[PDB]
Design an enzyme around this catalytic site. Structure first.
Site, short mmCIF file in Angstrom:
data_model
loop_
_atom_site.label_atom_id
_atom_site.label_comp_id
_atom_site.label_asym_id
_atom_site.label_seq_id
_atom_site.Cartn_x
_atom_site.Cartn_y
_atom_site.Cartn_z
CB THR A 60 -1.01 -0.09 1.17
OG1 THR A 60 -1.78 -1.24 1.07
CG2 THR A 60 -1.79 1.15 1.32
CG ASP A 111 -0.17 0.13 -4.46
OD1 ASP A 111 -0.82 0.98 -3.71
OD2 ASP A 111 -0.24 -1.10 -4.15
NE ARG A 145 0.96 -7.69 -6.50
CZ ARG A 145 2.05 -8.53 -6.70
NH1 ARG A 145 3.13 -8.53 -5.88
NH2 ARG A 145 2.07 -9.40 -7.75
CE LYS A 186 -4.20 -0.54 -2.12
NZ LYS A 186 -4.56 -1.28 -0.95
N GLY A 200 -4.48 1.48 5.51
CA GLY A 200 -4.96 0.78 6.74
C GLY A 200 -5.91 -0.29 6.26
CB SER A 230 2.25 -0.73 4.97
OG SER A 230 1.95 -1.46 3.77
CG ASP A 248 5.04 -1.91 1.11
OD1 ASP A 248 4.10 -2.60 0.58
OD2 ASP A 248 5.14 -1.66 2.33
CB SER A 251 3.98 -1.25 -3.90
OG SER A 251 3.53 -0.17 -3.09
#
Lengths: 250, 204, 206, 243, 196, 241, 232, 231, 226
Positions: free
Chosen positions: I1, I17, I19, I33, I47, I129, I166, I169
């Site tokens: 994220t 992203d 994913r 997103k 979150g 994250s 990350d 992502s």
């Protein structure tokens, strides 16, 4: 306190008459004439604004209220009653169908929902009926373009064409005579200008005549560009300048 | 422990050429006592199909909740509830118990009959839309199905090429999961006909 | 004050029934002729629409026939406005039962319920009664087909053929004569339409 | 003509006949006066002693609100107490929230709006009192009078009762002889003068003089009743002029 | 976390840091903990950010009614509205707010409301976990009723230490001069005083 | 009979009670005038204080709804005070929810909605007063909205109230057609105040003193009232013209 | 429930024949940071009663509002009624006990320890304790917090029984209180320099003397006794 | 007329008709006369009975050790107001260690009477009560009028044929105030008064009821051989 | 994220992203997103993704009502305030994290709001994250008075740093550009990097490899006559 007004006050008479519903029509007639014509590719609705002082900004008073981007509303009868109903419509639509199903209601559904409020308000005492009759014009995918008349009795009925207001009866005979099955938006517009002129002596100019449509797609006013097959606002109030051009073809 | 794993079980959904297919195992237990092989997780309200995973008592309640709401919808609007609209109603409803949520995982399948668009959807306990047309899987052996399905599937499968693909995908994984097995139903849903096929397979 | 308008609105006449009920009966009757005929193998519902124009689009309009479910329908005689409320209530109430027992509700319980709501408005509150008569058509296996009319008095009775609205008298007469036990669906259609052809207060029957 | 049978409702007059009759009861009531002084305010009242079997200085109608507000009333006696009690609950809430003795303009709103809520309706009958109230706070002298109608402004001087005519003319003379405003201590002798002259209008039954005051610092920013020596002085000075 | 309100001759000056941390991560270092709720009464925020934001919006509304109906809130009057809410909702809302203002008549006044909540009028107050250091420095070097220029200097000097000793504290000195001239925002870059 | 007193339908269409609300207005006899500056919105009102018994300074027709929005009232004093309280509450509540002060227009709309409720409900009654909200909104400049006891409302570029408004209304139309400009466009706040006072004097035909006026001036984010002494100076400029 | 934030350390008191002497340190301690200094904790109500409060400064001010309400309610209506049915210390003590009672049963105490000191209209010595545990009792010497354990035995050395109230005079009581504030300060960590002292006689009223300071600390043993054990 | 049914609607005069009828009811009822000295308050009340078979009915009821009332007018309404007071006396006493003053108690009933005339469809209570008490401030006699006027008085009488008592009260007004420290003589004076107020239906040993509360006299009702003494 | 928002002179740029993940099992390889409260306020969630989707809808309704009623374009400030209150009611149980970015008649705006209901102003801000991988890139490239052109660049780069670091992502990177007073340009699938290795050999079954107990036509349409 004690409020002794719960009891019905729209009580029958010896001949079954509904006193308060009959009187509400009187306020309707003092309205300024509105009309609605339904075509194969849209709806046009038209009215002249209520008179006011020049000094007053005449933009503020608007008898045509967008209720959802897909459904517009126009009225004849009192002004005060109309406003309360208009808020109430936007409200009930979001809570009960845009939180659940994430979408503006179907057009017949919204008419059904307004109609209940009018039924209680005339059934129950101490609250006089709304003194307005509506024309709710809208689009939805399921029933296509639609036009419905909503009465203060709260009965609602589909009409190929109709008029409400001062000259509702005269205008209905006129509209019937010019209703066709090859109607277009354009042909409809023409007719609405003839009708309106016969029934209103006022001046015809783009800043005090309302012409508003349910039907033009707007990828442009979608407010975003990213998937054009979204229909966007159906509702568009024609701009003054445009209106002025069509008054050549009154 | 997990409420989902009392009965466990799996539901698989894929899309094919102007078709969908949805299938599931018929196993129902209360822990290590297998109770019934006749239990159905897949129900149908019109062309919207709903396989439900998790806590068995919560499944029967959710069905009922939704039995009521879908019929009232059909009567007032004079039309079946679209997969599209339905997915939304599903998401709102799961939400209703925000905290202490519903312990169930719905998986939607259907054909928007008004446009001809293959449609499948997934959900979690709180409820959010998980959109992915290639596959949606769910349950205790969701892990297993993922590998299998991604590899078998090739974008745009023929109606009965889709049939081989779904059938095998379920069969292999289900025996190889202890809370799945005991036969299967495979609903092949095409627009003009729906066929319901109990499959011959090791109950073990 | 506020007690000047009030006057014991909901009080029996000497007879035993409120004046108001009568008056509401008067209103319903303005509505066109509605016929329901019960037969061995089905029920025919037919109604002739009045308070209507062709300018008003009649290819979509509803003031008569509403679908409650597959086995259960109504024909409305009265205020479309008073009716709308009841049809919604009747729908949710049936649905609740369906969900609760997963067996269709009986016809007799559906009728009884709606009838209490009616009674409520005159028992207390001073609210005017609801001006609706419905023709209830249903099927269950227990009694076969069942045909009720219900009144704004909230009474209901069983019938084998009945009419409400305009020319209820003239229609009721012919029907009794024509009612037979070997009667089928197909006869009832013809029969009704001949009744209707005579009771018409319109130009013609269309 | 049916607006006389319907409590507080708009009419072709606009003012309802009920609100009008409530004034008639106030007028039959005892003389009440209020003087806005330079550095305080003095409330005086004629208390008519109908009989001698009333206990002197014990029927007192000066009602205290907070530690700085004096209120005094004419009209319907139940209606008068109920507005003051209701005012006290309100005042207590304000002092809690804001930890400040309530301002006079503040309290003026508390009192007025209770009346309004009962003119809007016809279910609830509104007060029939005029209440003379005020005191000293941080914003200064404040002398007010509220009507049964619900309209108030400040007053250099206010009057009500049968002898309001005596009160009003002398009140004007005072502003004429003192354009800087006559001081709180000198004003206590004058108040008593006006009461006595006003007693000629109300001469049929005897009176007992009762004075109180709130002053910036003569009382020491407190509420007190004018008593003993000071009271006594004011008795002599007054008598001496009508003689 | 370093916040203070310090009175002087002609009114009162607020100063505060900007760096606001969640964890060892510096969450935001352009935060404005000096906040508007009435023209001449501002508020210094410390403690859970959420709880403090929420209360500032609720009191604000109250303050606007105060003005309209009962006249301008004093600094005392305003402080009292915080005290109530935080006492009654002690456990829910943990908020330590200094409420300080300049009246023309009554001069600069400083009132602090603890987590537990209780008004204190004090000539000046100093608070925050990163500002412990400067209790010694400040008290000792306080000069009462400073010249205006001396009041600006004074806060700057103290804050050089506080940033040295504490990592949570850092960033621009955001300042609000509450005087008869009104509200003047000042900003001073951290570089000018950390190195010099 | 009954249909007059309560707010049920009358056989005419119009409630007796709404008409009665206008007649009642006429009985104060205090006339208010509103015009727009380029940058200001100017209100002047007649101020009547007949004897010294009533204190001069306390007489008011102005209510500060918030720190920015002024309101002038035409009509009965108790009713004005009541309506004034409600409007202050609304304005604030909107700040709470949305993070900013209510626009002038939005505020007017809210009051008109309330007005409606009072004319359906039987025991509630429509207010006898007329509420004229003035402001200069930040974004939109000068703002005049007049709200009626019906709840009928519209915006303005100048309006006048009181029983003797009829004279002012025509004189305003004539003045503004001649000039052409829709409204006074002087930047300067002082000029628009001189113009407003002088125009009233022509229209009603009656000259005034400082004592007979009460002057409100709204600019962006602020409402303030002009002191007595400023108003004297304003008259020196008028005398000189 | 209630977790203690800001608190006062001690209020100390005794009886003598014509009244009562109540004194207290003035302090708001917030943990070991002594954040507020000179928080006064004696509140005179009239001249016949003083309410000395220990514990929460938070709760102490919530109780203050109630104290405000108590005076006004009495003063309301006729002045001559409450002149001659004036607030005794007994009237204030009762009012208070009741409020506390309700709050703590619902598990949300009003977290304070109170001594209500005064003399009746009668002049009878009234000295009583009420606190957050709902324990209510009268005793010839009283003190709360630290001061119970420490200051109080000195006071108790002088007045032991109810017969030693007449024998003690006002002079004797005052010397005793004073001697005890000194000791107290010496041996309490959470002490303030600043303390106030109140004498209430039923013959002269309230004399309030504020901002007394503790006398020079004794340091005879600081300069001789060194180390702490075996090691230095 | 028309302002008799309605309570919300002020009479033209501004004096409600219901309140004129409530006062009317007070007059038809039993004579009761009250008087006070400084150390005592004394109440005299005529007991009534329908018929010979009916036992005499006490009209003065001890409310508290420091309070009691007499009723004149309707008996049923008296009961409502009297219960109310018992609750309030006890509540106050429990909270403040402060006995409910006579003066304060009077305001409570007052605000209560106000609410039912305010509110449409209520009715005033058709009853008067003379509330007597002895507390640290002194002896007292308060007058409760259904009009909502509360007055402290040296003496007063209500009921039928109140007039004999009224002339007696003026006359003996200065005399009974300097009598203190003697209960017995104060009680004798009251008996003299009540027998003037009566014409026909002579008092006997149980047609009379007496109550006295005082500094040194707990609130006691005297009947029978006790009042034989003061006859 | 990974979400970044970077405010610039001519508007405010959000990029993220696609994913979406539920645990280390990738729930949806691609699914935006970027979500819309309104066409002039777009948002993205970090979150608990479930929590974010829901709360935007609920509140976003109220905003529409306010928006119609004030007869102004959706106001950034009006939305932000409303949301803050709702979270606060549960004391921030709601696990929502939103970047609330949009245009209104007063200019261009960016704010954060956290699960407890902490808010901050920023000229650039980051949530996810992968907030920490993204934020590093920005603070370097940044200068005062970014142009439109520059703001696209920083946003694309920052999300691209997060792909390498990350794990949540990955796949398509979408950007939407919200300009003052102007339609929101979605450059959906702004980048499209290569995913999914074309099949090495078939795994498609020959016909006749399944064994089928029975078949039966099961109706789903409303009953029809014969």
């Amino acid at each position: 306190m004690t409020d002794r007004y719960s009891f019905s006050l729209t009580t029958f008479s010896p001949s079954g008459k509904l006193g308060q519903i009959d009187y509400a029509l009187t306020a309707v007639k003092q309205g300024v004439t509105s009309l609605g014509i339904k075509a194969t590719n849209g709806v046009v609705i038209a009215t002249e604004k209520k008179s006011s002082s020049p000094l007053a900004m005449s933009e503020t008073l608007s008898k045509v209220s967008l209720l959802t981007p897909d459904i517009g509303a126009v009225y004849s009868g009192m002004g005060p009653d109309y406003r309360v109903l208009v808020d109430k419509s936007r409200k009930v639509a979001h809570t009960s169908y845009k939180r659940i199903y994430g979408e503006y209601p179907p057009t017949k559904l919204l008419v059904s929902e307004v109609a209940k409020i009018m039924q209680e308000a005339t059934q129950s005492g101490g609250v006089r009926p709304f003194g307005v009759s509506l024309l709710i014009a809208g689009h939805d995918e399921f029933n296509g373009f639609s036009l419905y008349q909503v009465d203060p009795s709260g009965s609602y009925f589909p009409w190929k064409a109709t008029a409400i207001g001062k000259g509702s009866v005269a205008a209905k005979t006129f509209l019937e005579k010019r209703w066709n099955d090859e109607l277009e938006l354009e042909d409809a517009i023409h007719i609405a200008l003839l009708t309106l002129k016969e029934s209103v002596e006022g001046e015809f100019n783009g800043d005090t005549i309302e012409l508003a449509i349910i039907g033009d797609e707007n990828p442009d006013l979608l407010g975003y560009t990213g998937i054009p097959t979204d229909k966007g606002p159906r509702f568009r109030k024609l701009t003054s300048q445009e209106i002025n051009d069509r008054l050549e073809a009154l | 422990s997990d409420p989902s794993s009392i009965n466990g079980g799996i539901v698989v959904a894929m899309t094919g050429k102007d078709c969908v297919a949805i299938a599931c195992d018929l196993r129902l237990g209360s822990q290590s006592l297998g109770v019934s092989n006749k239990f159905e997780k897949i129900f149908h309200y019109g062309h919207v199909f709903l396989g439900i995973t998790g806590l068995a008592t919560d499944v029967t309640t959710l069905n009922e909740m939704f039995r009521y709401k879908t019929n009232l919808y059909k009567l007032k609007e004079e039309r079946a509830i679209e997969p599209e609209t339905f997915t939304q109603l599903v998401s709102s409803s799961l939400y209703e118990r925000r905290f202490g949520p519903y312990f169930v995982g719905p998986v939607v399948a259907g054909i928007n009959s008004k446009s001809g668009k293959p449609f499948i959807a997934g959900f979690d306990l709180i409820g959010c839309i998980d959109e992915a047309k290639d596959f949606i899987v769910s349950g205790t052996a969701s892990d297993q199905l993922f590998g299998m399905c991604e590899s078998l599937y090739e974008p745009n499968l023929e109606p009965e090429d889709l049939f081989e693909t779904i059938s095998q995908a379920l069969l292999n994984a289900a025996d190889r999961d202890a809370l799945s097995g005991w036969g299967a139903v495979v609903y092949i849903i095409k627009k003009d006909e729906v066929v319901k096929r109990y499959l011959k397979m090791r109950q073990d | 004050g506020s007690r000047r308008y009030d006057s014991r609105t909901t009080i029996f006449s000497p007879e035993g029934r409120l004046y108001q009920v009568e008056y509401a009966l008067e209103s319903i009757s303005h509505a066109g002729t509605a016929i329901g005929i019960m037969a061995s193998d089905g029920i025919v519902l037919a109604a002739e629409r009045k308070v209507t124009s062709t300018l008003l689009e009649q290819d979509t309009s509803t003031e008569k026939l509403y679908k409650l479910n597959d086995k259960i329908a109504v024909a409305v005689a009265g205020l479309t406005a008073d009716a709308e409320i009841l049809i919604n209530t009747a729908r949710i109430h049936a649905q609740n039962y369906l969900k609760t027992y997963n067996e269709d509700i009986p016809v007799e319980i559906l009728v009884r319920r709606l009838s209490d709501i009616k009674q409520g408005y005159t028992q207390h509150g001073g609210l005017r009664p609801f001006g609706v008569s419905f023709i209830y058509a249903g099927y269950d296996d227990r009694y076969g087909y069942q045909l009720y009319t219900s009144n704004p008095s909230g009474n209901y009775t069983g019938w084998k053929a009945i009419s409400v609205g305009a020319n209820t008298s003239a229609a009721q007469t012919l029907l009794q004569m024509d009612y037979k036990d070997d009667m089928k669906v197909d006869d009832a259609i013809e029969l009704a339409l001949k009744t209707l052809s005579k009771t018409t207060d319109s130009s013609a029957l269309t | 003509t049916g607006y006389d049978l319907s409590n507080s409702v708009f009419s072709p007059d606009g003012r309802n006949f009920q609100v009008e009759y409530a004034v008639k009861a106030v007028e039959n009531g005892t003389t009440s006066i209020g003087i806005k002084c330079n550095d305080g305010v003095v409330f005086a009242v004629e208390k008519l002693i109908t009989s001698k079997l009333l206990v002197p200085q014990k029927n007192v109608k000066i009602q205290v609100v907070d530690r700085h507000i004096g209120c005094v009333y004419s009209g319907l006696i139940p209606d008068g107490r109920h507005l003051v009690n209701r005012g006290r609950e309100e005042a207590a809430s304000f002092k809690k929230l804001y930890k400040t003795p309530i301002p006079i303009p503040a309290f003026a709103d508390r009192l007025g709006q209770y009346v309004q809520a009962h003119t809007l309706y016809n279910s609830v009958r509104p007060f029939g009192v005029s209440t003379i109230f005020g005191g000293v706070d941080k914003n200064g002298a404040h002398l007010y009078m509220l009507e049964p109608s619900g309209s108030y402004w400040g007053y250099k001087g206010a009057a009500t009762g049968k002898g309001r005519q005596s009160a009003k003319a002398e009140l004007e003379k005072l502003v004429d002889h003192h354009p800087e405003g006559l001081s709180a201590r000198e004003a206590v002798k004058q108040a008593a003068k006006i009461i006595y002259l006003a007693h000629e209008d109300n001469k049929e039954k005897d009176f007992e003089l009762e004075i109180s005051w709130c002053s910036l610092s003569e009382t020491n920013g407190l509420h007190k009743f004018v008593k003993g020596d000071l009271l006594q002085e004011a008795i002599d000075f007054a008598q001496k002029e009508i003689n | 976390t370093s916040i203070m309100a310090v009175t002087f001759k002609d009114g009162v000056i607020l100063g505060a840091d900007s760096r606001t941390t969640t964890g060892a991560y510096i969450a935001n270092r352009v935060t404005d903990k000096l906040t508007r709720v009435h023209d001449k009464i501002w508020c210094c925020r410390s403690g859970s950010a959420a709880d403090t934001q929420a209360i500032a919006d609720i009191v604000q509304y109250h303050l606007e009614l105060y003005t309209s109906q009962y006249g301008t809130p004093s600094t005392e009057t305003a402080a009292s509205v915080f005290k109530e809410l935080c006492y009654e909702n002690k456990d829910n809302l943990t908020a330590g707010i200094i409420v300080a203002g300049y009246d023309d008549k009554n001069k600069g006044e400083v009132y602090t409301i603890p987590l537990g909540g209780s008004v204190h009028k004090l000539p000046y107050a100093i608070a925050g976990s990163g500002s412990t250091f400067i209790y010694g420095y400040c008290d000792k070097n306080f000069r009462e009723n400073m010249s205006k220029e001396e009041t600006v200097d004074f806060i700057k000097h103290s804050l050089s230490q506080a940033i040295k000793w504490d990592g949570s504290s850092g960033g621009v000195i955001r300042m609000v001069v509450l005087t008869a001239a009104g509200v003047e925002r000042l900003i001073f870059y951290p570089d000018e005083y950390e190195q010099l | 009979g009954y249909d007059r007193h309560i707010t049920i339908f009358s056989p005419e269409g119009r409630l007796y009670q709404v008409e009665y609300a206008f007649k009642a207005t006429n009985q104060t006899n205090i006339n208010s005038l509103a015009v727009r500056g380029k940058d200001c919105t100017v209100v002047i009102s007649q101020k009547k204080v007949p004897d010294k018994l009533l204190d001069p300074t306390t007489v008011s027709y102005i209510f500060c709804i918030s720190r920015t929005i002024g309101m002038v009232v035409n009509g009965p004093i108790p009713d004005a005070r009541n309506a004034a309280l409600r409007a202050k509450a609304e304005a604030a509540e909107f700040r709470y929810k949305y993070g900013y002060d209510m626009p002038c227009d939005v505020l007017a709309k809210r009051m008109a909605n309330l007005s409606q409720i009072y004319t359906q409900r039987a025991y509630m009654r429509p207010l006898g007063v007329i509420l004229t909200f003035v402001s200069v909104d930040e974004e939109l400049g000068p703002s005049i909205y007049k709200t009626d006891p019906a709840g009928y409302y519209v915006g303005y570029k100048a309006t006048a109230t009181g029983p003797k408004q009829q004279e002012i209304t025509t004189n305003l139309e004539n003045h503004f057609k001649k000039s052409k400009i829709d409204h006074i466009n002087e930047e300067s706040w002082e000029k628009v105040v001189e113009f407003a006072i002088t125009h009233m004097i022509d229209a009603l035909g009656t000259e005034f003193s400082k004592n007979d006026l009460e002057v409100g001036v709204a600019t962006k984010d602020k409402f303030f009232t002009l002191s007595a002494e400023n108003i004297e100076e304003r008259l020196v400029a008028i005398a000189e013209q | 429930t209630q977790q203690p934030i800001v608190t006062g350390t001690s209020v100390i008191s005794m009886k003598y024949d014509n009244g009562v002497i109540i004194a207290a340190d003035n302090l708001g301690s917030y943990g070991s940071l002594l954040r507020f200094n000179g928080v006064e904790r004696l509140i005179p109500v009239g001249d016949n009663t003083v309410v000395g409060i220990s514990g929460d400064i938070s709760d102490m001010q919530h109780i203050e509002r109630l104290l405000k309400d108590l005076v006004t309610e009495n003063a309301y209506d006729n002045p001559l009624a409450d002149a001659e049915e004036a607030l005794e210390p007994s009237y204030i003590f009762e009012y208070l006990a009741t409020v506390m009672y309700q709050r703590r049963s619902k598990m949300n105490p009003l977290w304070n320890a109170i001594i209500v000191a005064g003399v009746q209209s009668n002049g009878d010595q009234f000295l009583r304790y009420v606190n957050l545990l709902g324990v209510t009792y009268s005793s010839p010497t009283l003190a709360t917090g630290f001061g119970a354990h420490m200051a109080n035995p000195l006071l108790r050395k002088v007045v032991d029984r109810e017969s030693d109230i007449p024998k003690t005079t006002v002079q004797v009581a005052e010397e005793a209180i004073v001697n005890a504030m000194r000791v107290l300060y010496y041996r309490d960590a959470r002490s303030s320099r600043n303390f106030s002292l109140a004498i209430i006689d039923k013959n002269t009223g309230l004399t309030f003397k504020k901002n007394l300071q503790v006398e020079n600390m004794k340091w005879d043993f600081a300069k001789d006794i060194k180390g702490y054990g075996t090691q230095k | 007329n028309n302002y008799d049914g309605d309570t919300v609607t002020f009479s033209p005069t501004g004096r409600l008709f219901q309140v004129e009828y409530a006062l009317e009811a007070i007059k038809q009822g039993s004579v009761t006369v009250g008087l006070r000295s400084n150390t005592h308050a004394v109440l005299v009340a005529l007991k009534r009975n329908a018929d010979e078979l009916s036992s005499y009915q006490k009209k003065i009821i001890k409310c508290d050790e420091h309070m009691g009332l007499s009723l004149a007018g309707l008996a049923p309404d008296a009961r409502v107001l009297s219960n109310y007071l018992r609750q309030q006396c006890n509540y106050s006493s429990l909270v403040f260690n402060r006995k409910l003053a006579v003066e304060r108690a009077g305001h409570l009933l007052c605000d209560k009477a106000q609410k039912n005339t305010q509110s449409y469809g209520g009715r005033p209570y058709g009853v008067g009560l003379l509330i007597i008490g002895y507390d640290k401030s002194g002896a007292h006699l308060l007058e409760f009028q259904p009009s909502g006027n509360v007055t402290e008085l040296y003496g007063t009488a209500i009921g039928a044929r109140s007039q004999g008592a009224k002339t007696y009260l003026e006359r003996t007004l200065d005399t009974f105030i300097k009598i203190d420290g003697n209960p017995d003589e104060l009680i004798k004076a009251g008996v003299e008064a009540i027998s003037q107020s009566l014409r026909d239906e002579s008092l006997t040993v149980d047609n009379l009821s007496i109550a006295i509360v005082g500094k040194d006299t707990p609130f006691t009702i005297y009947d029978g051989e006790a009042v034989a003494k003061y006859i | 994220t990974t979400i970044v928002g970077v405010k610039f002179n001519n508007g405010v740029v959000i990029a993220a992203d696609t994913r979406s993940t539920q645990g280390p099992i990738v729930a949806d390889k691609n699914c935006a997103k970027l979500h819309r409260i309104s066409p002039k306020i777009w948002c993205a969630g970090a979150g608990t993704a479930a929590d974010t989707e829901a709360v935007t809808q609920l509140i976003g309704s109220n905003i529409e009502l306010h928006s119609l009623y004030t007869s102004r374009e959706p106001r950034v400030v009006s939305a932000l305030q409303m949301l803050k209150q709702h979270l606060f009611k549960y004391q921030g149980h709601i696990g929502a994290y939103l970047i609330v970015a949009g245009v209104d008649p007063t200019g261009s705006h960016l704010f954060s709001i956290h699960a407890h209901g902490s808010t901050d102003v920023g000229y650039y801000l980051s949530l996810g994250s992968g907030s920490l991988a993204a934020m590093a890139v920005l603070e370097s490239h940044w200068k005062q008075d970014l142009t439109k052109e520059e703001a696209i660049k920083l946003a694309s780069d920052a999300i691209q740093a997060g792909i390498w670091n990350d794990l949540g992502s990955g796949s398509n990177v979408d950007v939407c550009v919200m300009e003052i007073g102007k339609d929101a340009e979605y450059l959906r699938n702004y980048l499209t990097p290569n995913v999914r290795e074309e099949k090495q050999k078939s795994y498609k079954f020959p016909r006749g490899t399944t064994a089928v107990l029975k078949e039966s036509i099961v109706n789903i349409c409303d009953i029809q006559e014969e």
